[PDB]
From Swiss-Prot:
Keywords: Acetylation, Cytoplasm, Differentiation, Disulfide bond, IgE-binding protein, Immunity, Innate immunity, Lectin, mRNA processing, mRNA splicing, Nucleus, Phosphoprotein, Repeat, Secreted, Spliceosome. Probably forms homo- or heterodimers. Interacts with DMBT1. Interacts with CD6 and ALCAM. Forms a complex with the ITGA3, ITGB1 and CSPG4. Interacts with LGALS3BP, LYPD3, ZFTRAF1 and UACA. Interacts with TRIM16; this interaction mediates autophagy of damage endomembranes. Interacts with cargo receptor TMED10; the interaction mediates the translocation from the cytoplasm into the ERGIC (endoplasmic reticulum-Golgi intermediate compartment) and thereby secretion. Galactose-specific lectin which binds IgE. May mediate with the alpha-3, beta-1 integrin the stimulation by CSPG4 of endothelial cells migration. Together with DMBT1, required for terminal differentiation of columnar epithelial cells during early embryogenesis. In the nucleus: acts as a pre-mRNA splicing factor. Involved in acute inflammatory responses including neutrophil activation and adhesion, chemoattraction of monocytes macrophages, opsonization of apoptotic neutrophils, and activation of mast cells. It is found in: Cytoplasm; Nucleus; Secreted. One of its GO terms (cellular component) is ficolin-1-rich granule membrane. GO terms for molecular function: carbohydrate binding; chemoattractant activity; disaccharide binding; IgE binding; laminin binding; molecular condensate scaffold activity; protein phosphatase binding; protein phosphatase inhibitor activity. Its main location: cytoplasm. One of its GO terms (biological process) is RNA splicing. This is Galectin-3. It comes from Homo sapiens. The modification Phosphoserine is found at residue 76. The keyword 4Fe-4S does not apply.
Length: 138
């Protein structure tokens, strides 16, 4: 019962062994979800499930620097389902973000923005009801 878009501060930035857990439900008739890990105005890691990109479901990942998007990484494994509850876990490792959905590994994204301590906010947006968003160390 949190308001979307939601901004989760990450005090002192991200560090290896930080685990972020996001619980919610995908809306009826969803088009998109987005997670945006921010370094100021830059987007260090954009994680973007798209439910209807030319009649295909795809996950797009990218980085935005100085208002310019870079090279997209795309994943066709698509674990989200319209109408249904999900869990996203993002584990920060030394060289990449590791993403699992509903307890199954989905993808890794190599760090392009290398000042991890400066990635200090997470924005959560899109066609979801958000139940909780939190972090811990493992």
């Amino acid at each position: 019962p949190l308001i979307v878009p939601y901004n989760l501060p990450l005090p002192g930035g991200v560090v290896p062994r930080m685990l972020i857990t996001i619980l919610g439900t995908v809306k009826p008739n969803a088009n998109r979800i987005a997670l945006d890990f921010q370094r100021g105005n830059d987007v260090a890691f954009h994680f973007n499930p798209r439910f209807n990109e030319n009649n295909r479901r795809v996950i797009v990942c990218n980085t935005k620097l100085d208002n310019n998007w870079g090279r997209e990484e795309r994943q066709s494994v698509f674990p989200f389902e319209s109408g249904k509850p999900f869990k996203i876990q993002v584990l920060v490792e030394p060289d990449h973000f590791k993403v699992a959905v509903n307890d199954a590994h989905l993808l890794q994204y190599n760090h392009r923005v290398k000042k991890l301590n400066e990635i200090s906010k997470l924005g959560i947006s899109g066609d979801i009801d958000l139940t909780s968003a939190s972090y811990t160390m493992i």
